[PDB]
């Protein structure tokens, strides 16, 4: 039931009217700029004829204002757990020769674990010096060597794809009701223009986008849906962050393949003579997914999965940061039709006084056909002219007051048969 | 239950004996280096008399090897949660003028929250630009300003003290049984000597400290004991680590006091026009305490709360990384007199072959009073002499074999006789 959220009068300088003895028609030629309607509501342009009762409206409903994520970088991740094997040798036995233990290389497997065979899994190798001497079962008093071989294994049989958006492609869908009542639906992009019955329409300025977009990233769970993540995409594994372990494919997460990348020192070890514990404290990306699972709101946007060919989209919820440029190409409009009555009620009066922006008055208007409500205050200094329709709509325009305390009686009608309406509110002063 | 884990023989170098009359007496003079016995077990020195039936033992038990934490730096931490207030003003209204919102400073309270007034709590302030225009209730198309005031509040009425150990004080406690059998208990620090009836005992080498001590820290939960944390202490508050929020006291943590220090950006915000959510993802220090609550074992050590005092200690579990220097002040020992027989079962053989250290035989000995066990085992090559003790005790000594698999055979005669025994093993 929203009607005009934004309403401007076409400049007298783009309008020319003539009367054919009682029958008057006007031509629009030139350009008007109007802010796009808030989502669900209309941007409206009012045409005035020569008489005060000659009014027509062009209405442009913002059906939706959508932003589609163009995906940039991507990696796969999932959940992992370490499995360790250990074997302790006394000083001067096996590899536990003078310095080997303390200079042990991560990628070298100890002879102690040659029975494990070949591996293509993410893995690492440690040696921890432990106590020597007879109390720890060694003939030699020097430190014994706890050799350790560890591999990572996927804890789930599914994986998650983390990505960013390099661009958000704006599509503004508009439902246009011409002056003559004909309805059409169009869509526009930032650089688009469409021919209309009266000329053309384009986006003069389009600043629709995701503010702080570099601080969002997304997760896809294949066959399930998407999640938002409230952090920038990480191009490098960083311990304690999503992506600290990452792979180039879904299957490589699942097999924990050695091509996967990982941040250093993710596995902690507690060597205890012949006992060993190894643990991880990894970010659980399935928890992160469930925390951000779509749909979600951030700022004035709703992020949701695309219906159909899948990706993520964001929808504006309120204002649309775009101006429509309306080009009229010598287009004729008449004022034909019988007026019917309307009922109206005051809704609100909001904004400032003695300012350029003025104050927005909103009325609920109920009728059985298309027309115009006209209202004036006692002294004819203020006038309201708003669309009337079959059914009920909330309709708003700007009024200019010079006082913060407003209590103004208007008489309104759609057919000349006036009824009272009280507009009141409190407006702020600017500086 | 365990006896001599380390057995050395008194060097003929520091030994002089003779038989002038009705019996034989021996004199010990000089130093003798011996490895400390494993905790609970004994380091042992055998005195060889001029006969074969003449043998005496000096026994030194390791009762405990103990390391006490000398606490260094400390901080208090606990559990916190944010509470935030918000108020949005349209562009050109109130404080919301280009370009103050985007320039807002954490310490500056917005005039939107005058009704909160005076505070000594941890707190911050933010401003977030949000949609403008009539669709977001504003007469101006420029961004509106969501002003936010947030304070941290304690979510638990208890705190935790995180602390560091700048040094670990070593005390070694030895129980000495002299050749004549008199018992004695001494304590040694890393530098220390103690005099004995026969001379003295000193810590020659002492490496009983905590390896990797730089990567440990500790927590005290007031009146509930201690925990070990498997990471360094840090004097810098960092996000995602214990102490990311820290204070100087129990009360300050509980009041979420403004003197508490905190790492940057711990509170996250979701501005949603007129709605706002604010959250933290702080590590829970009480979970950290729980997971590390003492007693805990690391390496060859048990970390535990001090028994007769306040603080934490670590106790050596296996080998003691220390050499004992024994000094003998021209000390005389006699051998009188008779000694019975005992039940000795073979236990094991362990070591290498054709090496310096060699094999180590261990026997289970149950006997009368205190005696000495001999073995006619492999006579003309090998012999075994060990302490017989009133009770059940395992006794070990060194042996040199130059073959891989050892299948040996012994008739042990401490009696002398009457008994048999077998020994078998491999390197
Ligand atoms: C003074 O009065 C005016 C007019 O009443 C108020 O403006 C109105 O504000 C409301 C609440 O924010 C807006 O409602 C929103 O409507 C959108 C529109 O969605 C579309 O509308 C149809 C209704 O038939 C819906 O069923 C569809 O979903 C469709 O998408 C909706 O998405 C929001 O959830 C919300 O309901 C309304 O659009 C707006 N009207 C106009 C003409 O702009 C104004 O807030 C008020 N000011 C005050 C009280 O200070
Ligand atoms: C060979 O046999 C000997 C039997 O004496 C074994 O030596 C013994 O080893 C164990 C440690 O595994 C020790 O037992 C322990 O006692 C301490 C202190 O009381 C306690 O803290 C431990 O929990 C455990 O109960 C024992 O001290 C030690 N004996 C001696 C004399 O040193 C040796 O391990 C055997 N080797 C084998 C079977 O391979
Ligand atoms: C281990 O890494 C070193 C250093 O890059 C490399 O030279 C060597 O080939 C690797 N050794 C393996 C895989 O055994
Ligand atoms: C807040 O930060 C500003 C910027 O330096 C400073 O002027 C002000 O004194 C600070 N407030 C304090 C220290 O309480």
UniProtKB/Swiss-Prot annotation, chain B:
Region described as Fusion loop: 90-96, 132-143
Disulphide-bonded residues: 4-44, 17-26, 69-165, 84-278, 90-138, 96-145, 101-127, 131-136, 247-260, 342-414, 352-355, 362-396
PTM comment: Glycosylated. The glycans can attach to host CD209/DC-SIGN, and may play a role in virus entry into dendritic cells. Palmitoylated.
Protein's membrane topology: Single-pass type I membrane protein
Cellular location(s): Virion membrane; Host Golgi apparatus membrane
Sites carrying sugar chains: 107, 348, 390
Function description: Structural component of the virion that interacts with glycoprotein N. Acts as a class II fusion protein that is activated upon acidification and subsequent repositioning of the glycoprotein N. The glycoprotein protrusions are arranged on an icosahedral lattice, with T=12 triangulation. They are able to attach the virion to the host cell receptor CD209/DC-SIGN and to promote fusion of membranes with the late endosome after endocytosis of the virion.
Quaternary structure annotation from Swiss-Prot or TrEMBL: Heterodimer with glycoprotein C.
Protein name: Glycoprotein C
Organism: Rift valley fever virus (strain ZH-548 M12) (RVFV)
